[PDB]
Amino acid sequence: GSAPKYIEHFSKFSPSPLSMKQFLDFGSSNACEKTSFTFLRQELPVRLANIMKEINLLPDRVLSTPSVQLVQSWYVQSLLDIMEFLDKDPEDHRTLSQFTDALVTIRNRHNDVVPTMAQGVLEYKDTYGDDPVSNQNIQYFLDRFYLSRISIRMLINQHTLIFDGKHIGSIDPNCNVSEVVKDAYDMAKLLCDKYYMASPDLEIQEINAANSKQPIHMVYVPSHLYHMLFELFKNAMRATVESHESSLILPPIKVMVALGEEDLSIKMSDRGGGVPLRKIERLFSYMYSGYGLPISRLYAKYFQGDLQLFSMEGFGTDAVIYLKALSTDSVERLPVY
Amino acid sequence: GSAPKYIEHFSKFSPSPLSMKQFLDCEKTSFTFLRQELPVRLANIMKEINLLPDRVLSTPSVQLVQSWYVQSLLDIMEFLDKDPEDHRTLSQFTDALVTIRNRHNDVVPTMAQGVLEYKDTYGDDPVSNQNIQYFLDRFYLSRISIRMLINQHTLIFDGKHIGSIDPNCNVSEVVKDAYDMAKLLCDKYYMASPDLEIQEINAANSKQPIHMVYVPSHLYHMLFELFKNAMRATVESHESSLILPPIKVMVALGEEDLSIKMSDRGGGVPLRKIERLFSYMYSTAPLAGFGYGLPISRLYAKYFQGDLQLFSMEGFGTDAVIYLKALSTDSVERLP
Numbered sequence: 001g002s003a004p005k006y007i008e009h010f011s012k013f014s015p016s017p018l019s020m021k022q023f024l025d026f027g028s029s030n031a032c033e034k035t036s037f038t039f040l041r042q043e044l045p046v047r048l049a050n051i052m053k054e055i056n057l058l059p060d061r062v063l064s065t066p067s068v069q070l071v072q073s074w075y076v077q078s079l080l081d082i083m084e085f086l087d088k089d090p091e092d093h094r095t096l097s098q099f100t101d102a103l104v105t106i107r108n109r110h111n112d113v114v115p116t117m118a119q120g121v122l123e124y125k126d127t128y129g130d131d132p133v134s135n136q137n138i139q140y141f142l143d144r145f146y147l148s149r150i151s152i153r154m155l156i157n158q159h160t161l162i163f164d165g166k167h168i169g170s171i172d173p174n175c176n177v178s179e180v181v182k183d184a185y186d187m188a189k190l191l192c193d194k195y196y197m198a199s200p201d202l203e204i205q206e207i208n209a210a211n212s213k214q215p216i217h218m219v220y221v222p223s224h225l226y227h228m229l230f231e232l233f234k235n236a237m238r239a240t241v242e243s244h245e246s247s248l249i250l251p252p253i254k255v256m257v258a259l260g261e262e263d264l265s266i267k268m269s270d271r272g273g274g275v276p277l278r279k280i281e282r283l284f285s286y287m288y289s290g291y292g293l294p295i296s297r298l299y300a301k302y303f304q305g306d307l308q309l310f311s312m313e314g315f316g317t318d319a320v321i322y323l324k325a326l327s328t329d330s331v332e333r334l335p336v337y
Numbered sequence: 338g339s340a341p342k343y344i345e346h347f348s349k350f351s352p353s354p355l356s357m358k359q360f361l362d363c364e365k366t367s368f369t370f371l372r373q374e375l376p377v378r379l380a381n382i383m384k385e386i387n388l389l390p391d392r393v394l395s396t397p398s399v400q401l402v403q404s405w406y407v408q409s410l411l412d413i414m415e416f417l418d419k420d421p422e423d424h425r426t427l428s429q430f431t432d433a434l435v436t437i438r439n440r441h442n443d444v445v446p447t448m449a450q451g452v453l454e455y456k457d458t459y460g461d462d463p464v465s466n467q468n469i470q471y472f473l474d475r476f477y478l479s480r481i482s483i484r485m486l487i488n489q490h491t492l493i494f495d496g497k498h499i500g501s502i503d504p505n506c507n508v509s510e511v512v513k514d515a516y517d518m519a520k521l522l523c524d525k526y527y528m529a530s531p532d533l534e535i536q537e538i539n540a541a542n543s544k545q546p547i548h549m550v551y552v553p554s555h556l557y558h559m560l561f562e563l564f565k566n567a568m569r570a571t572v573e574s575h576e577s578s579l580i581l582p583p584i585k586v587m588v589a590l591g592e593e594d595l596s597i598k599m600s601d602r603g604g605g606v607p608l609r610k611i612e613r614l615f616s617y618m619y620s621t622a623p624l625a626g627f628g629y630g631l632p633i634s635r636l637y638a639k640y641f642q643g644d645l646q647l648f649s650m651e652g653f654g655t656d657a658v659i660y661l662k663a664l665s666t667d668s669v670e671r672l673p
């Protein structure tokens with residue numbers, strides 16, 4: 001019952017971004033469970049307190065809403081839950097087992113965060129209006145808040161999956177990008193054929209510059225790449241099918257996977273009639289949008305990547321996921337506090 | 338000795354952005370309009386020049402350009418009380434605009450010289466980069482706005498084609514002109530050049546030729562710069578290879594937007610270096626170089642509510658899209 005002092009103390013501590021290589025040494029063996037416990041009990045309240053302090057600095061008109069009070073109550077409970085293990089001994093295996101259950105329960109509280117935050121934005125539009133300045137402030141915090149949420153849940157999933165009894169938790173060091181593209185297409189195809197009476201076909205063209213025709217693989221979180229590519233397929237298929245409804249030919253959703261010296265780019269092109277440039281900004285705005293696209297961009301940025309969209313009204317749209325090719329360059333992108 | 342006084346009066350007035358329709362819409366009318374509007378657009382940018390820090394404002398290039406803008410401002414003020422109905426008054430006005438245009442011809446290399454002076458004198462810091470980028474975007478855009486007025490007046494009033502504006506601007510014709518020019522330059526230096534492929538996508542009127550109302554001279558400069566960088570990257574990347582992949586272009590006509598995508602296969606670029614292609618400072622150094630006329634090219638696009646964007650995939654190639662307003666109703670001057 002001392003959360004305000006806990007937030008002030010740990011807000012001074014800066015978050016600690018981690019590279020892809022560091023995640024592997026932690027998950028290299030089950031013997032590293034103690035080192036992960038001693039690190040996570042310190043780092044988790046730092047990331048919580050930093051965003052929690054940013055949450056409290058919000059204006060009271062936003063902070064006083066029931067949606068914001070609920071999420072802040074979850075962060076406080078999980079913060080106080082993690083701080084019970086600060087005084088415990090890592091050499092006791094029971095202390096380690098209790099921490100995992102705590103982390104699994106911490107996630108269960110924050111499962112419905114994105115739908116909850118979407119309610120507060122809709123409440124804001126109908127109570128205070130949807131003006132450009134309100135969008136910039138809502139975009140600024142939610143990107144940082146969700147980027148903090150992506151970073152925090154990343155740390156939890158690695159410990160629960162590794163320390164349970166080829167894939168290092170949620171990270172696949174031999175991640176076949178084309179297979180993840182095909183999997184995201186297959187899920188979108190299933191939804192497309194149920195909603196519509198057709199589905200665009202898939203085309204993939206890999207471009208390995210240094211090793212032409214060799215399969216392109218990287219070190220990444222495939223669950224993140226699936227989330228980004230899947231949200232892109234749903235948009236490409238919706239526009240492609242609805243644009244060619246009076247037409248018989250259904251163009252394919254062509255994809256390209258280029259492996260450069262630094263970038264691993266993943267372009268997805270449709271022919272859904274495209275979008276005017278005026279409305280491209282609207283697709284990434286939380287208030288004006290239906291958050292799979294901005295959240296997908298955060299997954300890209302989370303490891304120094306990016307996700308960009310460029311369209312041609314009357315023809316179609318192209319979307320490129322930019323990922324760091326090297327695991328060295330793949331480092332956590334956290335909100336600057 | 339009232340140059341600061343003249344700047345204060347007309348700087349108070351905000352510039353009036355004009356539409357493409359207004360440009361189509363007589364020398365007395367343009368004479369009376371420009372003698373008010375020109376000193377207003379000069380005063381606003383000359384105001385921001387003095388807002389610069391002492392590091393930049395004290396440079397010889399800045400003070401040199403100020404001498405042209407000050408001298409150009411004073412040239413317009415003689416005609417404030419003159420007679421529009423006098424043909425000698427109107428002719429002197431038209432003659433006065435040509436010298437001001439020719440006076441400011443060496444502004445871009447002069448301003449480019451000042452950036453190099455700052456890079457070597459104070460270093461390449463992020464804060465000065467954004468300020469130089471923020472300032473040069475507004476200064477060069479003001480230069481385009483002023484030249485557009487001067488060219489429209491001097492060319493219309495000489496004593497189907499409205500000066501610099503082509504109401505039936507076939508976009509693919511301007512693309513071929515810029516390509517053929519860049520190809521000859523590519524052939525002269527590299528003794529080789531990629532081939533061009535053009536496609537058109539008229540959504541509202543299939544198979545109708547894509548025409549618009551635009552300034553083809555501004556459109557030629559943008560496409561010319563893009564080909565020069567696409568040809569170099571395609572050539573230099575395939576110097577050991579035999580086949581040069583072609584430079585493909587598409588022209589889409591939507592309900593409101595007219596887009597122009599250009600695509601090469603010059604091995605693409607990392608995402609980190611895309612910023613420096615549009616930066617004045619990082620493109621500035623002691624066919625064309627990668628990112629030379631590209632900052633100013635993006636300004637020509639935004640001058641009528643357009644934009645210019647680059648998207649590259651390292652190991653493959655690069656895409657470049659020019660977004661333009663299809664309708665002259667939405668084509669309006671973006672003024673600082």
Ligand SMILES: COC(=O)c1cc2c(nc1C)[nH]c1c(C3CC3)cccc12
Binds near residue numbers: 233236239268318
């Ligand atoms: C007004 O938004 C739209 O109607 C709209 C939106 C998208 C679209 N096509 C249309 C007509 N393709 C998209 C894509 C594909 C992979 C390249 C991604 C995200 C949104 C869209």
Ligand SMILES: COC(=O)c1cc2c(nc1C)[nH]c1c(C3CC3)cccc12
Binds near residue numbers: 603606
């Ligand atoms: C260091 O920048 C470069 O070397 C560089 C620059 C460009 C490029 N390819 C490379 C390797 N294509 C370009 C294009 C074409 C139409 C798509 C336009 C402008 C610059 C580039």
Ligand SMILES: [Cl-]
Binds near residue numbers: 441444480
């Ligand atoms: Cl000038």
